[PDB]
Amino acid sequence: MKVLFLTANEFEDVELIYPYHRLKEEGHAVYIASFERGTITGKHGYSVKVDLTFDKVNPAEFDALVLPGGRAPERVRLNAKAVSIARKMFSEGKPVASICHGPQILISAGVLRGRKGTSYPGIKDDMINAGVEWVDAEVVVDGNWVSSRVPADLYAWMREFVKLLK
Amino acid sequence: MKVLFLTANEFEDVELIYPYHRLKEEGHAVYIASFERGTITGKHGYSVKVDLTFDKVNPAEFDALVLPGGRAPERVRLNAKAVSIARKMFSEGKPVASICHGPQILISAGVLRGRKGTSYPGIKDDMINAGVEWVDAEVVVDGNWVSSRVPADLYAWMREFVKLLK
Amino acid sequence: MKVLFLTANEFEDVELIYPYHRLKEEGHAVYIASFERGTITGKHGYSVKVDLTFDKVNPAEFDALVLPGGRAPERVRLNAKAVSIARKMFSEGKPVASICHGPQILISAGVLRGRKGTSYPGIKDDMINAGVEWVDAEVVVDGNWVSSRVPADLYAWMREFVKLLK
Amino acid sequence: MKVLFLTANEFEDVELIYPYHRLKEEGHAVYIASFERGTITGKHGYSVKVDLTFDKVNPAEFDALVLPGGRAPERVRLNAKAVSIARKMFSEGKPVASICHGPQILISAGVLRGRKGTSYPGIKDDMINAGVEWVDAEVVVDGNWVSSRVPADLYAWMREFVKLLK
Amino acid sequence: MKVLFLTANEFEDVELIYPYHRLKEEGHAVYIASFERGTITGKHGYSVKVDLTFDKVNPAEFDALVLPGGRAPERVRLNAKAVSIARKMFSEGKPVASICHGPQILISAGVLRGRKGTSYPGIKDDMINAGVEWVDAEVVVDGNWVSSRVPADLYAWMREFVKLLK
Amino acid sequence: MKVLFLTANEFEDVELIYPYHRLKEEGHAVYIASFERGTITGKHGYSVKVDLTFDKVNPAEFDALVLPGGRAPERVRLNAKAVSIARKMFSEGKPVASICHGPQILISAGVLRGRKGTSYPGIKDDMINAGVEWVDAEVVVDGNWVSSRVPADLYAWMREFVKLLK
């Protein structure tokens, strides 16, 4: 499968790097999309190369979506093209994985009312106001939506997600 | 007047320090409340002393409330006592000043339905979902609630808040 | 009024940002002058844009002068044009505000003989040797010269300087 | 299985965190051993809790061994007990994964003569002088010994190691 | 000889470490005095152990004095016991080496009027107001006083100083 | 004499700066060689200018060689030209000083079999496997080869090296 990541500077480093490698283990192709080509740098100083910009993404060409956390989702969610990608892929029923602040992008896409999931506890009230049935669990599977809360949850986050790509 | 600040580590430094001194200039008493007595440190490394904890605050004893930004509001808003302080003071009509991520504490208080205000743009969708009529202005006055967006609005933010304390 | 700031990289961040906004509140125009156009960054990482260089400043065009601290005054004071600006404005009776290491620029201007003021305590011996009657107070007003010591004096520093601009 | 990590301060953060979670996903128990109980911190600032000290480790009680990289291996390899843990588990045929600087501990254990593997290229000449047949590949499997070079190899590293624990 | 250093946190690292080792090469005993026992840390993060506090120094027991730069001299020069040590040793004619901001301590001792020397150029006007004949040179020898300006001067600074201890 | 340094980014700052100045004191010329012209930066933030790149170095034109430590030796030792510079000067009997990780370049040059010396203890087993008789001492002199372990050894390191250039 082709797996797309939406992110930017100040991503939470391990929430990007862990799924990136865990999905390559399975043989999937992984793509990093951001505002500009070049490199982006995490909160803790790991740098990754950007594969394409939001403007060049055709959502039809990707099979699954990963939304890491950090401070990056508060900037990505103000980009109409990035929010449009997540709206389309989530509403088409493609697998979507989010963790920590990552679902702020789905809040802004307007796709979450009635869905069941989790997030960083610091934004649970915002999830609830977007209509989420919010659950305090290390991983929640709701149809195509796999969500987790914090870096401690990584093992469970990707355990469930990889099942949906098989 | 006795002006109370609700904050914690990783406050945005100038959004705490600027209103602290601007209000001291007017002769008001300023108190920093947080989780624990001691010092708290800002995103940029400035330190300040905590006057009292959230448990020891009696909202009746204070006349106004200031909610600086940074990352601290996402922690504060998870503390039931801190949120109750903000609920009582805001709903009793006492003047409340908020900037950048500050109003996340008011979202969790449940007091923003049908009110008008602003915030850091990265959380404008969460403000709208809480019931806020969201405005892109350097300062917004809506009764007792004075709201601003970013550090560049500091001059206008306190210009309007100072008037409500006369 | 047109208020001029003389500064450079490694300014003490709140000693620039606090008077910048406090004076904007009053409706004054504030200009940052430095060695080169662009941005300058403070000790704690805040950045601000340079409005004009020292070479393009005509002291006749400005009404007041602010000299923040940090490590920048030790560089500024070596620039003959920056020192000449401070000499002319201070000796023409225009209001001048200085804090922490700020008055090092006035020492090099040669205009402090027999004047009364304060500074960061770590340079009080250099103030005395320049001819200053040195006072340990949160703010000192001596004609046109308003002087303070450390960031904890900000509220009193601008309280007194604002009066001279009315 | 019970999986043991030998490490210390200044480990390469993702070379510890990634196998940690990848092996919890399979249901294995994971134990971090270092010099002292408490927490250790990686080169990039992530912190993990130490489960037991080197002195308390009985190699017989553990089924597999992971040696992450960073600078920590140059300090671990000076601790005679830690080197004997590695020596015992490796020579008993138990699965051992090493990456980047990790195999420096195995050099010091004296168990690599005639074996085949890789490492951070910066220490390849030291691997060769310890008797290793050194290969430039993203992962090498030599019996019980799974070796990789750098953080970009993580996906392949644990892909092969996980097979040996089934 | 017994060589005494007066310093504190935020010394310029190489201006302390270079003379420390250069003087041990010759067989002299070197002692670090500061406010408190324990360790002090330079601007660039090197740490050194403090041998004794200002309170325990008997100036008669030391043969020569070294004053490194950094931000530390602005704190040391406010300590009456530290300034007293430098006053006594310099006025008794013992060898004294200073660099960069180091002579701020001698300014405060009141021993420099009529002497010839150099400093960091940023404080040359303060040297002049203390009565120094100020010279722009990599090293100046004036009787017992060897002075230099910046880290680039280290080689010449200690070349001349070691001659005075022979 | 003309003295050559082989190094790169992330050198141990004082292991380069101290021999640099100590050898200028004697009147020797000193040249920094690295991968690219411009500046390189040490682990602690000090910057030095690169005089020439490895490709332009003719070993015949230089009389002595210094190998500082840090992480830079693990990158320099992968550059075939830099290793051949070290190999040529060392085997021609020219004076060579190494400290901490520095001798990793000499391991890769193949010139240490049967020689006597020291290093950072963290790589002593690698020195032993390269054929060195490894000694725990602050300085070792083996013909043209002066070796030390750590920054605390600087005084002794250059004390012995300076003798070989007279």
Numbering used by the authors:
A (entry chain B), B (entry chain C), C (entry chain C), D (entry chain A), E (entry chain B), F (entry chain A): 1 to 166
What does the paper say about this structure?
Tb-Xo4 was added to the protein solution before filling the channels. It triggered the nucleation and the growth of large PhP1 crystals, which completely filled the available volume. An added value for macromolecules crystallized in the presence of Xo4 is the strong luminescence when illuminated by UV light. Final crystal structures were obtained either from a single large crystal and two wedges (Nb02) or from combining partial data sets from several individual crystals (RNA, CCA, Lip and PhP1). In the latter case, the use of ccCluster considerably facilitated the choice of partial data sets to be merged.
Here, a microfluidic device is described that enables the production of crystals by counter-diffusion and their direct on-chip analysis by serial crystallography at room temperature. Furthermore, the crystal structures of four proteins and an RNA were determined based on serial data collected on four synchrotron beamlines, demonstrating the general applicability of this multipurpose chip concept.
